[PDB]
Amino acid sequence: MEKSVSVILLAGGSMPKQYIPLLGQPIALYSFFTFSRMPEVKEIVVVCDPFFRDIFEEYEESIDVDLRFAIPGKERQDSVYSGLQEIDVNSELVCIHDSARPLVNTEDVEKVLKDGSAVGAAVLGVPAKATIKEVNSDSLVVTLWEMQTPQVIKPELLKKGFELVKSEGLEVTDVSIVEYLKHPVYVSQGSYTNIKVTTPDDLLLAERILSE
Amino acid sequence: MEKSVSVILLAGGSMPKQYIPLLGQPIALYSFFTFSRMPEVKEIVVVCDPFFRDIFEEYEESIDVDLRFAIPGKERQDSVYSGLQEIDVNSELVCIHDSARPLVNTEDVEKVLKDGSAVGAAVLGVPAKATIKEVNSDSLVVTLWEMQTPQVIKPELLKKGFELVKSEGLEVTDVSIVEYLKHPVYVSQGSYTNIKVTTPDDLLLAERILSE
Ligand SMILES: Nc1ccn([C@@H]2O[C@H](COP(=O)(O)O)[C@@H](O)[C@H]2O)c(=O)n1
Ligand SMILES: Nc1ccn([C@@H]2O[C@H](COP(=O)(O)O)[C@@H](O)[C@H]2O)c(=O)n1
Ligand SMILES: [Cu+2]
Ligand SMILES: [Cu+2]
Ligand SMILES: [Cu+2]
Ligand SMILES: [Cu+2]
Ligand SMILES: [Cu+2]
Ligand SMILES: [Cu+2]
Q1: Looking at the DSSP assignment, which residues form a beta bridge with residue A94?
Q2: Which residues in chain B touch residue A185, judged by CB atoms under 8 angstroms apart?
Q3: Which family does the record claim for this protein (chains A, B)?
């Protein structure tokens, strides 16, 4: 199913971390070009402070997908929703991705697109290597996976989910908007290299991984 | 309560990661000297391949605690048990620590000693920053803390716990031996800098943190 996915790529709000360059180019660019090459991908909706709009339209013509823009919102979920407002009337999947993960493998995006297609919603994850416990309010201890991005959701579902949060309330992140839904979320096994970039010790890391 | 804690320090089995030097000295040394300075600490039981025994007795005399040695075992829990076999007849707390965490703050060890004293068992933790989910066998999604070390346990309890695993079975790590017990485990809030050292991007990190 070709050109069937709309990407919502999150890059909104010294140098803003998803623009700190990695080897040569700003961080938001690695993931951005990965999705641009996949035939599945019809259009990209970038979520960014206009000041950074240029970082993107400068490759609009060397790219076999449609570029699009929408403005961010106050919280991580408002931007997603602003992103959602611009996607092709007829896209079958929304693929929400966070700029600060520049190292997402094409092969893992393919898998999670397939799983979001089969299930309706999927997210890439890896088995948490730390010992994690739930702790109760008295600080006593009461198979776990670490969640990454993309999250791949059918847009009808994602919308049903926005409007169930909007009616009532609450976004914590297990909040996905789609946690609340009763519809299933599949977790596609990803790669420990799809790290998120925050500390320049990440970049130090990001770089080590581009070398390998 | 002075000289009331026995440390069981875990450093057993190119260069074995807890001996990769940090700035100048092997990794097992940072934590080792931290515990040596605390008046609470009566003795240290180091768990190591003898080949590395020297790394330790070379400071036996510049140290206001008793040094001790025991040999490692096949799995992480067997070494602990080998460690347990050498502690002062009358220590009130066992403080189990992993060599590969060289950056444990004195202040956090103090807290967790206190909490293990009050509760009977405590471990230092920090609120996991990742989105963690439980996933079931069909790869579908069904307050979380990341666990560190030291673990501070009264030795009588720790022994009760060894023998309840020994009778029946199973050590997963939520396995602490003390998970299984019905006795409470307190989680003392630690510091995100008590990282564990594996990748030299950790060391790259360990170093950044010694600088700060
Ligand atoms: N209001 C907001 C807040 C954060 N974000 C996203 O947060 C991402 C970076 O991760 P952190 O929020 O965890 O720092 C940015 O790429 C940005 O797109 C957003 O898109 N809108
Ligand atoms: N049999 C074993 C296996 C591991 N270990 C501990 O594992 C620690 C390092 O962490 P990892 O096992 O997670 O690599 C070492 O300091 C070592 O003491 C042990 O003490 N006995
Ligand atoms: Cu344009
Ligand atoms: Cu519009
Ligand atoms: Cu990080
Ligand atoms: Cu000696
Ligand atoms: Cu003995
Ligand atoms: Cu690490």
Answers
A1: A6, A153
A2: 140-141
A3: Belongs to the IspD/TarI cytidylyltransferase family. IspD subfamily.
Experimental method: X-ray
Give CA–CA dist B11/B27, Å, rounded.
Answer: 10
Superfamily of structural domain B1-212: Spore Coat Polysaccharide Biosynthesis Protein SpsA; Chain A (3.90.550.10)
Question: Looking at the partner chain, which of A140, A185, A208 has a beta carbon nearest the beta carbon of B185?
Answer: A140
Judged by a CB distance cut-off of 8 A, whether residue A170 touches chain B is no
What does the alpha-carbon distance between residue A16 and residue B191 come to, in Å, rounded to a whole number?
25
Contact between A128 and B125 using a beta-carbon 8 Å cutoff:
no
Nearest-CA residue for atom 15 of ligand 2? B11
Q: Dihedral of CA A186/A191/A197/A199: which sign? A: positive
The structural domains of chain A, with segments of one domain joined by +, span 1-212
Half-sphere exposure of B134 (CA within 13 A, CB side): 8
**Amino acid identity, position B172:** V
Calpha distance A101→B32 (Å, rounded): 37
